[PDB]
Scaffold this active site. Structure first.
Site, PDB file in Angstrom:
ATOM      1  N   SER A 238     -27.564   4.583  23.783  1.00 52.00           N
ATOM      2  CA  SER A 238     -28.739   4.882  24.586  1.00 52.00           C
ATOM      3  C   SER A 238     -28.982   6.373  24.539  1.00 52.00           C
ATOM      4  O   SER A 238     -28.071   7.154  24.238  1.00 52.00           O
ATOM      5  CB  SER A 238     -28.473   4.519  26.061  1.00 52.00           C
ATOM      6  OG  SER A 238     -29.631   4.752  26.847  1.00 52.00           O
TER       7      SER A 238
ATOM      8  N   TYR B 142     -23.794   4.406  34.245  1.00 50.35           N
ATOM      9  CA  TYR B 142     -24.428   3.942  33.003  1.00 50.35           C
ATOM     10  C   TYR B 142     -24.221   4.987  31.921  1.00 50.35           C
ATOM     11  O   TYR B 142     -23.721   4.682  30.830  1.00 50.35           O
ATOM     12  CB  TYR B 142     -25.921   3.744  33.211  1.00 50.35           C
ATOM     13  CG  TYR B 142     -26.652   3.184  32.017  1.00 50.35           C
ATOM     14  CD1 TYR B 142     -26.281   1.951  31.456  1.00 50.35           C
ATOM     15  CD2 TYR B 142     -27.736   3.860  31.475  1.00 50.35           C
ATOM     16  CE1 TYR B 142     -26.980   1.414  30.367  1.00 50.35           C
ATOM     17  CE2 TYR B 142     -28.446   3.333  30.396  1.00 50.35           C
ATOM     18  CZ  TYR B 142     -28.047   2.115  29.842  1.00 50.35           C
ATOM     19  OH  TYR B 142     -28.749   1.590  28.787  1.00 50.35           O
TER      20      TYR B 142
HETATM   21  N1  LIG Z   1     -34.322  -1.286  27.326  1.00 50.45           N
HETATM   22  C1  LIG Z   1     -34.047   0.017  27.252  1.00 50.45           C
HETATM   23  O1  LIG Z   1     -34.936   0.962  27.783  1.00 50.45           O
HETATM   24  C2  LIG Z   1     -32.794   0.506  26.593  1.00 50.45           C
HETATM   25  C3  LIG Z   1     -31.736  -0.367  26.323  1.00 50.45           C
HETATM   26  N2  LIG Z   1     -30.590   0.084  25.724  1.00 50.45           N
HETATM   27  C4  LIG Z   1     -29.472  -0.827  25.439  1.00 50.45           C
HETATM   28  O2  LIG Z   1     -29.933  -1.960  24.727  1.00 50.45           O
HETATM   29  C5  LIG Z   1     -28.965  -2.983  24.883  1.00 50.45           C
HETATM   30  C6  LIG Z   1     -29.669  -4.315  25.113  1.00 50.45           C
HETATM   31  O3  LIG Z   1     -30.416  -4.262  26.317  1.00 50.45           O
HETATM   32  P1  LIG Z   1     -31.990  -4.568  26.366  1.00 50.45           P
HETATM   33  O4  LIG Z   1     -32.449  -5.376  25.214  1.00 50.45           O
HETATM   34  O5  LIG Z   1     -32.712  -3.303  26.647  1.00 50.45           O
HETATM   35  O6  LIG Z   1     -32.111  -5.433  27.726  1.00 50.45           O
HETATM   36  P2  LIG Z   1     -31.968  -7.027  27.901  1.00 50.45           P
HETATM   37  O7  LIG Z   1     -31.594  -7.309  29.309  1.00 50.45           O
HETATM   38  O8  LIG Z   1     -33.222  -7.716  27.489  1.00 50.45           O
HETATM   39  O9  LIG Z   1     -30.816  -7.529  26.895  1.00 50.45           O
HETATM   40  C7  LIG Z   1     -29.450  -7.413  27.180  1.00 50.45           C
HETATM   41  C8  LIG Z   1     -28.776  -8.536  26.412  1.00 50.45           C
HETATM   42  O10 LIG Z   1     -27.384  -8.527  26.646  1.00 50.45           O
HETATM   43  C9  LIG Z   1     -26.961  -9.786  27.144  1.00 50.45           C
HETATM   44  N3  LIG Z   1     -25.796  -9.573  28.028  1.00 50.45           N
HETATM   45  C10 LIG Z   1     -25.728  -8.839  29.184  1.00 50.45           C
HETATM   46  N4  LIG Z   1     -24.449  -8.888  29.627  1.00 50.45           N
HETATM   47  C11 LIG Z   1     -23.706  -9.633  28.762  1.00 50.45           C
HETATM   48  C12 LIG Z   1     -22.363 -10.006  28.721  1.00 50.45           C
HETATM   49  N5  LIG Z   1     -21.550  -9.782  29.756  1.00 50.45           N
HETATM   50  N6  LIG Z   1     -21.912 -10.784  27.672  1.00 50.45           N
HETATM   51  C13 LIG Z   1     -22.766 -11.182  26.664  1.00 50.45           C
HETATM   52  N7  LIG Z   1     -24.095 -10.809  26.710  1.00 50.45           N
HETATM   53  C14 LIG Z   1     -24.549 -10.049  27.742  1.00 50.45           C
HETATM   54  C15 LIG Z   1     -28.176 -10.410  27.808  1.00 50.45           C
HETATM   55  O11 LIG Z   1     -28.217 -11.818  27.716  1.00 50.45           O
HETATM   56  P3  LIG Z   1     -27.434 -12.859  28.667  1.00 50.45           P
HETATM   57  O12 LIG Z   1     -27.777 -12.604  30.118  1.00 50.45           O
HETATM   58  O13 LIG Z   1     -27.897 -14.229  28.222  1.00 50.45           O
HETATM   59  O14 LIG Z   1     -25.958 -12.735  28.400  1.00 50.45           O
HETATM   60  C16 LIG Z   1     -29.265  -9.883  26.896  1.00 50.45           C
HETATM   61  O15 LIG Z   1     -29.374 -10.709  25.760  1.00 50.45           O
HETATM   62  C17 LIG Z   1     -28.055  -2.586  26.053  1.00 50.45           C
HETATM   63  O16 LIG Z   1     -26.791  -2.195  25.566  1.00 50.45           O
HETATM   64  C18 LIG Z   1     -28.775  -1.401  26.671  1.00 50.45           C
HETATM   65  O17 LIG Z   1     -27.901  -0.488  27.307  1.00 50.45           O
HETATM   66  C19 LIG Z   1     -30.414   1.388  25.334  1.00 50.45           C
HETATM   67  C20 LIG Z   1     -31.411   2.332  25.539  1.00 50.45           C
HETATM   68  C21 LIG Z   1     -32.701   1.974  26.205  1.00 50.45           C
END
Ligand SMILES: NC(=O)C1=CN([C@@H]2O[C@H](COP(=O)(O)OP(=O)(O)OC[C@H]3O[C@@H](n4cnc5c(N)ncnc54)[C@H](OP(=O)(O)O)[C@@H]3O)[C@@H](O)[C@H]2O)C=CC1
Ligand SMILES: NC(=O)C1=CN([C@@H]2O[C@H](COP(=O)(O)OP(=O)(O)OC[C@H]3O[C@@H](n4cnc5c(N)ncnc54)[C@H](OP(=O)(O)O)[C@@H]3O)[C@@H](O)[C@H]2O)C=CC1
Ligand SMILES: NC(=O)C1=CN([C@@H]2O[C@H](COP(=O)(O)OP(=O)(O)OC[C@H]3O[C@@H](n4cnc5c(N)ncnc54)[C@H](OP(=O)(O)O)[C@@H]3O)[C@@H](O)[C@H]2O)C=CC1
Ligand SMILES: NC(=O)C1=CN([C@@H]2O[C@H](COP(=O)(O)OP(=O)(O)OC[C@H]3O[C@@H](n4cnc5c(N)ncnc54)[C@H](OP(=O)(O)O)[C@@H]3O)[C@@H](O)[C@H]2O)C=CC1
Lengths: 245, 246, 245, 245
Positions: free
Chosen positions: B141, B154
């Protein structure tokens, strides 16, 4: 006696940098609450400091235990009447490759170096807010520089740094000073805990031919930062062995 | 055209956001995709969609925080798809709020998922990636590069991922395992929905409403660029920011 | 008298942090060579320090002048016996947007903050090698954090930091300590020199609510670093106003 | 044809990364203004690019020369209609110890890598603002990592990075995207210019075993960044040889 009437809580006070820091702060007139898991070591240090005229409060504490942390802060304030300085020094360094790693190395380091430091910061904070106090985070060269076989250790220390900068942004306007100390190689018990044998040996050889920093040197850095006037926050001190590239 | 024909990619956090778009992007390049997350219903729907377009898909119900689940998911993947060539450690949560009087379950959740989970999955995949001279893609991030208020823990997890990953690169790069770190800024996903500190959630949503956000597809393209680079090139960091955001 | 018998050369000693550092080092027993362009201010300081018992060597010097730099190091060794501590403090801060900037702002900052600091480092290095001495680089928060309207200033200070880290790698094994001090907002003459009027006004406004750091605070950071035992290199001290996020 | 109708100005286009970048941008449909000191190499590239279907404007230019820089920008807008993409690629790498360094190494590096890049950024900025264009800064691993015998080179590249992050803060909201590319070891003419013979030999031995990055790889990084949709700023791409710790 720059700290006359002040109260310091020092985690990881049973050996190393924490012990020297407790001693240095006590020498400055601070009442010291000394915390660690080895009760016997703390009582021995506690006796020595008390015999030298210090006010000491001994705490058996595992910083990874959230409830234990709350009780330790409560106990300190009850016994010593407040909290002016927190030194988050409790820490462990378990070196080895990422490949095939013993993941309990990882959970231990994260629990102590990162979560434990965070829990103690949060628990102390209302008291530090009241006293416009200072939190001293014991980071590392490993929070600034990445070398091989210290991936998770470095993760925790870069994490401490980011946590602490953000904390500074949050509380500095209310007069809570956030200080981060980053020592390089210091002659303590730290390295004896390494579980990966080959890496323990490589690390020992790597540090064999330098004058290492002394725990007293790191204690002096803490003393410098905490005795600065309130309007100055010494946010980082990065201290390295002169002999070490 | 299929730059990744014959390769196997495992993408954690594939049920929505960046991970979903990444799985789609890699499948489009001809990679077989193992798709992992906790919402199996979402995964199945994505798998069906991908399978229908001619992709080879392996659905993994997985919590990355579950050390045992992680090992089993890697084993299931290599057995079903033949091996492992690309790992995308994308699963993560962002729970914003002040340090003072924080709900510390915000913290343990972020550390378990963002940091320990990513490390467990890295460690489990590594013997396979060594064999294939493969690539691990870490979803960091802007929070791994820049500290702002109300994101202390975070940011701790993301700076941690970065340090872990640079060290990993030093340890494995000579054996041909490429370590890629992707650092998105504000991206239009479900991420923000999970913030538990009400005041902070509202502050965050207000801040980001005023910019054109990055799209999950933009981050997928960053991953695509990094993994399709020739083997001798390791794109160790891509820091992609909204143009609209200072 | 931790520095009795030691020789320190401080650039930018005519005002601000340099003036306070010269004062602090003299107070520890150091002979001081004081360097700047305003000889009248240098003489007035030199008069005071000699009055207090220090040996003072006055240097009229523009750090941008390569031959001037060589010559200042030479006359110091002849006058004071050698060189133990160098403080590269001379600097200017010319803030403004990049768009239609007066590029003479840029050349001035580069010549003084970067090139001048580099020249003096190279010139002093032989003497510092012989004395196992210390070089103190006066960087800034601007060497760690980027804000708007300080692009070239920040370029010079990030540049100072990189140059100095690399220098440490090159000379630390031979006992030359490299110290980098990074002050935040400090109450000096610095802000008066801003040539972009609108930016000067904005900057003055930005810093008007806080308790600023004092020159003496930064002098103390320097004193702490240079009086540390030789085996310890305090490579970075980042000192921020507590009031300033 | 992602860049059809767009205009790119590439400095240091006569060899290496700049030449590959001009080729890559031309291939995507951009009109290219190609700038360097070796006109005969530039004309040879210009003929190739024209033969391939591109509109080419040839610029004899010393980037260290502010006047020449302003004239090159003006010449380009007159010849090609405007300016959409600026690639600040002109650079030199002069390696050697700080100790007893040939200081012309330093002045050349600052003039070209830092000042020239700033000059060209400032000169292009009015035009990039109108077009909501992109400036691409050719930094280096040397702007992220410090190694021995590269002190001043590293100062320039860390400086470029600070300048460019600040520039981003100042101009991003008006639609000017700031992209910084950070290559590790790339097989170009760069290393041939090293004046310190002993260091030249060490450096060339250092990189003798690895598969180096190719100029074409770096051009692809630029292509990726500039063809991203306008709402996305690929602010940093750090690309390392896989073979190199
Ligand atoms: N959106 C943004 O502005 C930014 C996001 N990021 C990073 O991008 C990555 C993805 O997030 P993003 O797409 O934004 O948000 P989302 O919430 O849409 O996606 C997160 C994904 O991770 C899964 N997830 C969460 N916890 C777990 C776990 N314990 N085990 C397995 N799967 C898990 C969720 O699905 P499910 O609940 O089905 O498990 C989901 O598919 C993260 O690492 C985040 O820190 C980085 C910079 C900016
Ligand atoms: N020595 C070095 O080269 C460097 C050390 N550091 C940091 O210094 C800090 C102190 O280590 P150092 O003095 O070197 O090594 P030591 O092992 O001597 O000290 C560590 C201290 O932490 C205590 N401790 C460990 N785990 C816990 C726990 N879970 N709860 C409460 N206390 C705990 C130990 O006491 P007990 O077992 O009784 O609990 C001990 O008192 C660490 O944070 C380390 O990362 C940083 C840079 C360099
Ligand atoms: N004040 C602040 O908020 C901060 C200051 N700093 C740094 O501290 C250093 C000192 O600045 P500060 O004390 O604040 O401001 P001052 O203006 O009060 O001091 C600057 C000193 O540098 C001297 N100087 C300027 N140009 C030259 C030159 N070309 N050759 C020799 N000496 C020169 C000036 O003296 P003279 O004109 O007589 O030559 C003066 O003594 C600078 O490097 C600055 O960047 C860093 C962070 C914050
Ligand atoms: N090669 C590598 O390992 C790496 C290189 N870099 C960076 O890439 C950039 C390009 O270098 P690279 O392609 O490797 O090496 P080259 O020497 O092949 O290219 C440098 C280009 O810059 C031009 N140039 C040099 N000085 C000036 C000047 N004063 N005015 C205008 N043009 C000038 C040269 O052309 P001419 O002589 O005709 O003027 C030449 O075309 C540099 O900024 C370098 O720092 C970054 C990371 C790694």
């Amino acid at each position: 006696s720059a700290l006359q009437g002040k109260v310091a809580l020092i985690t990881g006070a049973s050996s190393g940098i924490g012990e020297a820091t407790a001693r240095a702060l006590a020498a400055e007139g601070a009442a010291v609450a000394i915390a660690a898991r080895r009760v016997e070591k703390l009582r021995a240090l506690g006796d020595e400091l008390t015999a030298a005229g210090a006010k000491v409060h001994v705490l058996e504490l595992d910083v990874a235990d959230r409830q234990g942390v709350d009780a330790a802060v409560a106990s300190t304030v009850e016994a010593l009447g407040g909290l002016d300085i927190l030194v988050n020094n409790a820490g462990i360094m378990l070196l080895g490759p990422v490949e095939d790693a013993d993941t309990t190395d990882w959970t231990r380091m994260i629990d102590t170096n990162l979560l434990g430091l965070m829990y103690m910061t949060r628990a102390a904070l209302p008291h530090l807010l009241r006293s416009k106090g200072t939190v001293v985070q014991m980071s590392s060269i490993a929070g600034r520089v990445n070398v091989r076989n210290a991936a998770v250790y470095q993760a925790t220390k870069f994490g401490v740094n980011a946590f602490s900068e953000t904390l500074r942004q949050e509380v500095t306007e209310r007069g809570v000073r956030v200080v981060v100390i980053e020592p390089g190689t210091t002659d303590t018990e730290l390295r004896g805990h390494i579980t990966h044998t080959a890496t323990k040996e490589m690390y020992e050889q790597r540090i064999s031919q330098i004058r290492k920093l002394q725990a007293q040197d790191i204690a002096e850095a803490v003393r410098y930062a905490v005795t600065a006037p309130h309007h100055a926050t010494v946010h980082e001190i990065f201290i390295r062995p002169t002999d070490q590239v």
